[PDB]
Amino acid sequence: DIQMTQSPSSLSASLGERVSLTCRASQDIGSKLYWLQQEPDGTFKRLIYATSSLDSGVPKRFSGSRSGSDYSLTISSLESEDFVDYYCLQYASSPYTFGGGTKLAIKRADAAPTVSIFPPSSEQLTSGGASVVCFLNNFYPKDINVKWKIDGSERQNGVLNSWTDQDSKDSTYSMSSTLTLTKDEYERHNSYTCEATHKTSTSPIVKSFNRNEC
Amino acid sequence: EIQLQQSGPELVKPGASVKVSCKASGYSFTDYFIYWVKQSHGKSLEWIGDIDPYNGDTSYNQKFRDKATLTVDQSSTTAFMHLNSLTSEDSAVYFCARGLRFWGQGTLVTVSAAKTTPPSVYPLAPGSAAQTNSMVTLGCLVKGYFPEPVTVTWNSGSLSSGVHTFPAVLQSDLYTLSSSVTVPSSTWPSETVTCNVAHPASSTKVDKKIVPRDCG
C-alpha cells in the first residue's frame, strides 16, 4: 500500500502566522491528493482536491501545492477557527490511505506547572487501596516528564498519566499522574515524592508528603 | 444540502457483531459510491471499503475483508456497515462518506467485556498547610467505573473556573480519572468545596466534600 507520511504531527503557531503541513507519498500519487479538516466534534470537511484546487467556500488563506513526492497545505494567515486537525488523503491507488495528521495549536509564553501532591484518602485506604495523585497544571509548552519516588527510590510501576487538551482560554496544558499501590504497600513506606521536569527550568519541581505528617 | 446521518454509539461485548447505518440525503443516492473509514485513537485513519449503490458492487481493504460487510437499501437510501467477531481492536469511530468528500458525523463503537460499574469517588485534600500564591488546589479521584462518560462538577457548577477534568485511563477493563479545582486559600476550607460525579450509564450521582486534614 502507499504510505503518506505527514509532518509535523503538531505545530504551535499564532494568529496571523503563516504555516505549512506536508505529506510525502511513498509511490507516485500524481496529483490525486485531498486535504481534509477535522473539527473537535469530529466533523470532517474537504478543503482541497487534486493537490491544489480549493473547494467552494473554503477561505483563500488555504492553498495546496506539490514538489516531487511532497504535497503541502499552506495557511497564509491563521485565524482562530484554524487551530484544528488536518489530514491528507491519496486516491491514486487502492487502498486509499491517509497521512497520520497534524494538530495546529496556539503559541503562548512558557509557563511552569503548578504541582500538587495528594495522599490517599481515608475512604480509599479503608477499601484496601492507596492512590497518590500529582497534578501538574497550566504549563507551556506541552512536553513534560514526571518521576515518582518512594523513600527516595524511583518508582515506575503502577503509575498512570493523563494529559488535557490545550486550554481554550489560557492555552496551557495540564497533566495528572496517579501512583496506585495496595494499602499494605503504601503503609510500608513514608516519603512520597512527585518530580516534574519542564523546559521552564533545569531544576525539577519537587513535591512530597510524608505518610504520617500534616 | 447533502447530509449523511449515521446511527448512534454501539457498546458491545467481544465476539458480538454490530451494524451501523448511514442515511444519505440531498443527492441521487445511487450515483455516488459510499466509502467507509475507521478512525482509531481519535486521530489515525483507515479506508475500510466502498460500495456502489446502483448494483451492490463492493470493494474492501484487504485488512478488513473478513471484518466488514457493506450493504445498501436503495429505498431508505441508506448504506450499512456490519462488523463481525468484534474485539477491542475494533473500538473506534467509523465514518461513512460520499466519495471521500462529504462526511457523516461518525459512530463510536466500543468493544468490552466489562459490566456497568459506577465509580468510587475519593476526595483529594492537601496533606499540609502549604499555600502557593494564596491558592489551594483540591481534587477528586473518580475510580473504577464503566463505561464512559462521567461528568464532574464542583459546587454543583458554581465553581467552573480553575477546573481541570482529565481524560480517563483504562486499567483492567475499568476507567479512572481525576479532577482538580484551584481556589483562594481564603475560601477553603472556610467555604465548602464539593465534587459532584454523575455516571449516566448506572444513573448514579455522588457528592464528595473536600475535608481539610493538615495541621497548620
SS (H, E, C) B53-94: CCCCCEEECCCCCCCEEEEEECCCCEEEEEECCCCHHHCEEE
Q: Could you state, in order of their start, the residue ranges of all structural domains in chain B? A: 1-113, 114-212
Q: Could you state, in order of their start, the residue ranges of all structural domains in chain A? A: 1-108, 109-211
What the block records as the C-alpha cell of B105 is: 458525523
B8 touches chain A (CB under 8 A): no
Experimental method, per PDB record: X-ray
Residues B4/B22, Cβ–Cβ less than 8 Å? yes
The label of the residue with cell 456497568 reads B116
Helix (H, G, I), strand (E, B) or coil at B127: coil
Chain A residues close to B206, C-beta within 8 Å: none
B105 touches chain A (CB under 8 A): yes
> Which residues of A, range 83-102, sit inside 8 Å of B by Cβ?
85, 87, 89, 91, 94-98, 100-101
* Count of beta carbons in the 10 Å neighbourhood of residue B216: 5
CATH of domain A109-211: 2.60.40.10
Q: Taking CA atoms, what residue in A is nearest to B215?
A: A214
Q: Do domains B1-113 and B114-212 have the same CATH topology?
A: yes
Residues B100/A37, Cβ–Cβ less than 8 Å? no
User: C-alpha distances in angstroms, B106 versus A115, B67, B91?
Assistant: 37, 18, 13
Q: Residue A115 contacts by C-beta under 8 Å, 6 or more apart in sequence?
A: A134, A135, A136, A137, A194, A196, A205, A207
Q: Do domains A1-108 and A109-211 have the same CATH topology?
A: yes
A81 touches chain B (CB under 8 A): no
Helix (H, G, I), strand (E, B) or coil at B20: strand
The label of the residue with cell 486516491 reads A91
Instruction: Please give the CATH architecture assigned to the domain spanning B1-113.
Output: Sandwich (2.60)
Distance, in Å, from the CA atom of A62 to the CA atom of B46, rounded to the nearest integer, reads 25
> B148: number of CA atoms within 13 Å, CB side?
17
What the block records as the C-alpha cell of A182 is: 495496595
B93 touches chain A (CB under 8 A): yes
Q: Got the DSSP string for chain A?
A: ---EEEE-SEEEE-TT--EEEEEEESS--TT-EEEEEE-TTS-EEEEEETTTEEPTT--TTEEEEEETTEEEEEESS--GGG-SEEEEEE-SSSSPEE---EEEEE----B--EEEEEPPPHHHHHTTEEEEEEEEEEEBSS--EEEEEETTEEE-TTEEEEEPPPPTTT--EEEEEEEEEEHHHHTT--EEEEEEE-TT-SSPEEEEEETT--
Single-letter residue type at A27: Q
Distance, in Å, from the CA atom of A118 to the CA atom of A133, rounded to the nearest integer, reads 5
> A106: number of CA atoms within 13 Å, CB side?
16
Resolution in Å, one decimal place: 2.4
Distance, in Å, from the CA atom of B146 to the CA atom of B149, rounded to the nearest integer, reads 8
B132 touches chain A (CB under 8 A): yes
- Report residue A93 CA to chain centroid gap: 31
Chain B residues close to A175, C-beta within 8 Å: 166
User: C-alpha distances in angstroms, A69 versus A29, A91, A126, B100?
Assistant: 8, 14, 62, 22
Residues B104/B37, Cβ–Cβ less than 8 Å? no
What the block records as the C-alpha cell of B23 is: 442515511
Fold of B114-212: Immunoglobulin-like (2.60.40)
Instruction: Please give the CATH architecture assigned to the domain spanning A1-108.
Output: Sandwich (2.60)
Give the containing element (helix H, strand E) for B180.
Answer: strand B174-184
Residues B170-186 as b or e (16 or more Cβ within 10 Å = b): eeeebbbbbbbbbbeee
User: CB A42 to CB B93 under 8 A?
Assistant: yes
